[PDB]
Write a protein that binds this DNA or RNA. Structure first.
Length: 61
RNA sequence: UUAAGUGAAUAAGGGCGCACGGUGGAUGCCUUGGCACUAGGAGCCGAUGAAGGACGGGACUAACACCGAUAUGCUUUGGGG
């Protein structure tokens, strides 16, 4: 959801950031080659990256 | 039978009236926009980068809207069920 993000330190924040990046790259490729039953995840990953970034923003000033 | 005289009707096509269609959108009714004002708010925006724009953002994306690499959306405080 939203609250589990607030628990982790800045290290885990950047970790999950890079992990979501990689997942987005894989979703991108597997789009072009006729796959990905559940395409509604291409929203979730971008929105989660957004949430992580803003929550990071509010802490660092 | 001869002779003299009289002489109707038919339409290649056209006129008039009637009856039935075809093109064309007047007229009848109607409003999704306008016009002129009344009362009240408001009367500036900009080097923290303006007005206005180009390019992009969706499973599909040609356009219009909204958005901006956090891109058809992020956080929080109230409403709603």
């Amino acid at each position: 959801k939203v609250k589990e993000i607030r628990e982790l330190t800045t290290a885990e924040m950047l970790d999950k950031e890079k992990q979501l990046k990689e997942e987005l790259f894989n979703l991108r490729f597997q789009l072009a080659t006729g796959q990905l039953e559940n395409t509604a995840r291409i929203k979730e990953v971008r929105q989660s990256i957004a949430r992580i970034k803003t929550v990071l923003r509010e802490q660092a000033n």
